[PDB]
Amino acid sequence: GDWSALGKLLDKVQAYSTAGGKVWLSVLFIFRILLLGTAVESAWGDEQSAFRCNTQQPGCENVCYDKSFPISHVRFWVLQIIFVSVPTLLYLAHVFYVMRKEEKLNKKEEERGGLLRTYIISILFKSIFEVAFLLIQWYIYGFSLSAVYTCKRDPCPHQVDCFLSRPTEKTIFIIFMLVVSLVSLALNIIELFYVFFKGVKD
Amino acid sequence: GDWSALGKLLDKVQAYSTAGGKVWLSVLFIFRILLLGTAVESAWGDEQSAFRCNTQQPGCENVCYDKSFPISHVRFWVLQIIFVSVPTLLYLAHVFYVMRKEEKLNKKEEERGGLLRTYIISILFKSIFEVAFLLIQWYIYGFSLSAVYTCKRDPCPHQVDCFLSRPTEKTIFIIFMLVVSLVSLALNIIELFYVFFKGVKD
Amino acid sequence: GDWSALGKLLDKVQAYSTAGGKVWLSVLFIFRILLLGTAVESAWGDEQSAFRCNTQQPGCENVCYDKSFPISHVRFWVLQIIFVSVPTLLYLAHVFYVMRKEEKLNKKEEERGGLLRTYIISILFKSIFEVAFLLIQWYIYGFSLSAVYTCKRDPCPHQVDCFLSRPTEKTIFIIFMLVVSLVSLALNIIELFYVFFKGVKD
Amino acid sequence: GDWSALGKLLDKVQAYSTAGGKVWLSVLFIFRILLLGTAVESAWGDEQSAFRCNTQQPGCENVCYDKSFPISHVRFWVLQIIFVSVPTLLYLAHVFYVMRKEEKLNKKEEERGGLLRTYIISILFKSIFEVAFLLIQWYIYGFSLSAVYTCKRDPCPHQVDCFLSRPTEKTIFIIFMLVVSLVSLALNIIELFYVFFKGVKD
Amino acid sequence: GDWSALGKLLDKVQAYSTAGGKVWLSVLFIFRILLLGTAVESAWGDEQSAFRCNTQQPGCENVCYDKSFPISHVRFWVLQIIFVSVPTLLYLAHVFYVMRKEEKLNKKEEERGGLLRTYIISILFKSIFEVAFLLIQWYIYGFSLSAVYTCKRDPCPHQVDCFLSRPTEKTIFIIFMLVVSLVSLALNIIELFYVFFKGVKD
Amino acid sequence: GDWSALGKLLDKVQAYSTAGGKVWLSVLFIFRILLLGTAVESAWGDEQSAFRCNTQQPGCENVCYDKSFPISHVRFWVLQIIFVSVPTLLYLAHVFYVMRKEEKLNKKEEERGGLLRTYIISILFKSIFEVAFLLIQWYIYGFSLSAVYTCKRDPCPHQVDCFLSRPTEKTIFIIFMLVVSLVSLALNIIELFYVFFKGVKD
């Protein structure tokens, strides 16, 4: 049970990458998924059951929660990490099929090119998605949470004060994820610069 | 432990497919199942416990919820994704048995045809199911949710106002799924056009 | 790691079956288990917590629920699908042991029969169980659910109105399962007719 | 990856068994564990939360529940199925070690007996445990449940009426398990009779 | 895929053990983990939600529960079973590394001792931990539970009566675990006596 | 299926380590993860639902809980154990790639150094993280919990007394984790001293 075809595929996929990029970028993905699945996912469990508002009006809590949180952070991060990893899978499948076709051609008729361009495009799109998600998060929420929220949506009469759950831990986790995203963006830009320098000097 | 029979089966199954269809259509299924299982399934958890109506009448909440939501979106999508994937499994089993029979025939007696038609039929049925589900969803619900619902079902007296849970996130997820379905439909139609052009020109 | 003994066992088990029966009957089992485990099992979760009755008498809700639902549909279906699949497992084990004994005999002493009857018996019993379960379900419940139930069991005084949870989705799922069961019954009867015709003409 | 040592161990373990016992007794274990893990385990979930008594005295519900149910049925059945399966595992380990020692002896010094007795003892103990558990269950509970219970334990004043959850489904499952246990006992006694007849006639 | 190195490691690890100890001690661990994970873990679920005290003072329930149960039984048993199994893992790793080093030495330079002492030390420490845990449990709790508890901790005024959940089942499980622990201790002492007798007579 | 490349990688990774460090440090990680995942994670489940304060003011409980527990202990420990294990994974990947490159070089052109420095750096960083986390925990919380907390945050009027859940078990687990961390730190420092002594004397 020798896993040599996996080695061939891995070597072909990582032909144009640097030595460092083969390590940090791979470990960061594992770090990200572990942190997302273990710690943060449980702090957001009681985000609506422990949300309280000061009023007797039936229906103000629902509308005020929907106004405060149009989309939860955890699902935003899940979307972010899904959109960032699909280009690599597409490239891997492309390489797999190309290798199979080349092997068939070699066995049948013996009885720098497109791949670099695809690699560059994938690396560009990953950074584009990172920047877009960061900008959207900055515009909608920010990078902090306050304990008291003021609601002025009907049928609440003239105003309402509402109180959040765990507004301090979530800030810490938000900052952690921001740092991780910035590190990933920098590591992805370095690869583009290296590739273009190699392609220009020679 | 060489997995060569899997390669033979894969090559036989994807004989008439294009180069692109071998990649995007496969990755889209993984994207779909991951998104369905991770993010959306948790937003619909408190769909009946956090549903509130303004009245003292016992029994109005149950009937009004049943009137508003005859069937949840998540289970509708589960049915949609199950009905779209069975034709491929049937075709795969058919090819498996045909290959086994051909091998037996070759070993025993040496001591464009039906498969294309089945492929075309499967591709047609997948698109048919996609369109049918989209039309049903458009007729029953639409592609948005409102925060306030008006109920006029007995025993509620003369009318009742009821309030939903997370009416903004669900709209976002609905739009995402709509886009995914449209992309899948287009990618399936392209294959039919390509196959018919190849079969007509030659 | 060649899986050839599995192939021998599979060919021996499916010797008397038709070409179609090797595909539809196998896929239907997967469809059934997936649908049972994913969608329906979650709709029946709040079947007793969201069941409400109009009264102040302590104890009427419990007795009225027990009177309305002597046994839940999901567990009835689990029993149905367990009782329908055991004959095949028994036949498979029988074939396995017979093959081992035949191999031992061949190696030791060289230093249409019972199996058809067992196959017929198993196919008969599967249909018998299907019909029995369908008849019991028809007699006890029917194939629909109503939103309001009338209870006349002690200690409830003179009568009580009670209200169910999700009475419309469950009807849809009931109809789905009924259709699946009918399809399975028809596909099983076809095999008996084919076998008897082959055994009579030759 | 040929699994021949597993075959040798299986043949050695089942040397003195009948043809039928190799099939029904093995399938019954799978049936038992599936039924225990899928259906019954969920019906007993709300056994204490939905238990209600008619009184204002704080503490009567706890003591009356503890008096009605000294031990739940599901855990009783788990103990029953654990105590019935350990002798076979002990015998299997004994055979494994004996085979290893015999192989070592054969390679080193070539440079009806105890096993039957152990088999008989294990078969006897399995039936003994079955009978003991059945008798205990008959003495403590019976084979049915009633909807209303009468409690006369302090601090409840002079008497209390309490009401159970799902008293009709549980009776059905109890009867099912009783039938399964009786079938297992009969199948185990048959093996003893067969073994003793073979050992006496020859 | 022959698993011969596993056999070598197993034979080396169990060189000084008796015939019986290779069976009962191994099966007892499986029995213990199964019983701990299946039955008992669910009876302790509602240990604080169903705990009730007779008073209106806010805060007496929390302090009285903390006074009654400084540590739950299930977690005590988890610690007990973890502390008893680590010496064997350490010894196994030691043997693994020693065997690798010996193989390297044999291939390089051909181009009763410490292990017994380690075995004895491990066997001693297992019994020491068993006895220590039993003594601590006897001192803190005992081997039974009563339904009514009397609390005299502030801010409760002058006294309070509190009521437990399932005080009869837990006694049964406690007795079961006590018996298992005693059996394990005896089986471990037998090995020490056998080893010392063999080492003294010869 | 011989796992010899795993052996080569393991021997290369642990070339500069002592004999003891190959055992205790590996077993301690398993001990840590088992203890974290089995016992402690369930004691912190009802940390906010069972937290109670004496007042009628809506919103004081949320703010007072957020003030008492800026971050839960379990998630702090998860972060601690994640930050301590990434350097080893980075070093392992580095060694893997270096070995592959060396093999390629050997096959192509035949048709104490950096690794020690990386090992030292990783060992230093692990201890640095341990010390930093211990200091932060000491500064923020301490190593004990009290049953009564005094809150002076708005909108609570002038003061509030609040009561915690399970304040005695958590102290025990905190002490356990502290001891484990200290042991790990000592075992890591020993390796640095040994390495430097070997590098200086020779």
Ligand SMILES: CC(C)CCC[C@@H](C)[C@H]1CC[C@H]2[C@@H]3CC=C4C[C@@H](OC(=O)CCC(=O)O)CC[C@]4(C)[C@H]3CC[C@]12C
């Ligand atoms: C549900 C299962 C069947 C499919 C889901 C898993 C895949 C989507 C995984 C398998 C390997 C993963 C990759 C492993 C590591 C990397 C690190 C990083 O890529 C790199 O830069 C690697 C270094 C390099 O090649 O230069 C970005 C994420 C990525 C591609 C991962 C993206 C997600 C991948 C493709």
Ligand SMILES: CC(C)CCC[C@@H](C)[C@H]1CC[C@H]2[C@@H]3CC=C4C[C@@H](OC(=O)CCC(=O)O)CC[C@]4(C)[C@H]3CC[C@]12C
């Ligand atoms: C529970 C387990 C035992 C069975 C359930 C899994 C199957 C139903 C999976 C295995 C592979 C899956 C397929 C993998 C990828 C594709 C992509 C797509 O098909 C294609 O067009 C592939 C590209 C081509 O062949 O042209 C539509 C879904 C489909 C068939 C998937 C449908 C679901 C399949 C058959």
Ligand SMILES: CC(C)CCC[C@@H](C)[C@H]1CC[C@H]2[C@@H]3CC=C4C[C@@H](OC(=O)CCC(=O)O)CC[C@]4(C)[C@H]3CC[C@]12C
């Ligand atoms: C927990 C694990 C170890 C055992 C539980 C799984 C088995 C009970 C499964 C394995 C394969 C399954 C079978 C696979 C497919 C078929 C389709 C169908 O049988 C057929 O008619 C197959 C076609 C034919 O042979 O003619 C009825 C169910 C059955 C026998 C399934 C019944 C359940 C089986 C035996």
Ligand SMILES: CC(C)CCC[C@@H](C)[C@H]1CC[C@H]2[C@@H]3CC=C4C[C@@H](OC(=O)CCC(=O)O)CC[C@]4(C)[C@H]3CC[C@]12C
């Ligand atoms: C957690 C894992 C690692 C161990 C737990 C599983 C075992 C305890 C299983 C493996 C195979 C099982 C056995 C498979 C089938 C049989 C049927 C039956 O035994 C027979 O009579 C078999 C027929 C015969 O040999 O005559 C009684 C239960 C028993 C021994 C089972 C008892 C439980 C066993 C030993």
Ligand SMILES: CC(C)CCC[C@@H](C)[C@H]1CC[C@H]2[C@@H]3CC=C4C[C@@H](OC(=O)CCC(=O)O)CC[C@]4(C)[C@H]3CC[C@]12C
């Ligand atoms: C019942 C027995 C006879 C067989 C079943 C147990 C084995 C599978 C155990 C015994 C010794 C274990 C090994 C002992 C020590 C280590 C710890 C660990 O060592 C490392 O590689 C540390 C990582 C690093 O090098 O930095 C990796 C797993 C490994 C090889 C263990 C793998 C599993 C082993 C082989």
Ligand SMILES: CC(C)CCC[C@@H](C)[C@H]1CC[C@H]2[C@@H]3CC=C4C[C@@H](OC(=O)CCC(=O)O)CC[C@]4(C)[C@H]3CC[C@]12C
């Ligand atoms: C999470 C995974 C990767 C590691 C956790 C599992 C181990 C800690 C297991 C593997 C085998 C187990 C052992 C299997 C059986 C025995 C029986 C018993 O030891 C004996 O006396 C065996 C008989 C003998 O050798 O004399 C005490 C527990 C012990 C060592 C077990 C302790 C726990 C062990 C080492």
Ligand SMILES: CC(C)CCC[C@@H](C)[C@H]1CC[C@H]2[C@@H]3CC=C4C[C@@H](OC(=O)CCC(=O)O)CC[C@]4(C)[C@H]3CC[C@]12C
């Ligand atoms: C989700 C899966 C795919 C990846 C997550 C698991 C890894 C991060 C594991 C695999 C082996 C583990 C290691 C096994 C044992 C050790 C013991 C210890 O390292 C040692 O000192 C080993 C002894 C030595 O080499 O001197 C510190 C933790 C470490 C490196 C572990 C850190 C976590 C590791 C790398």
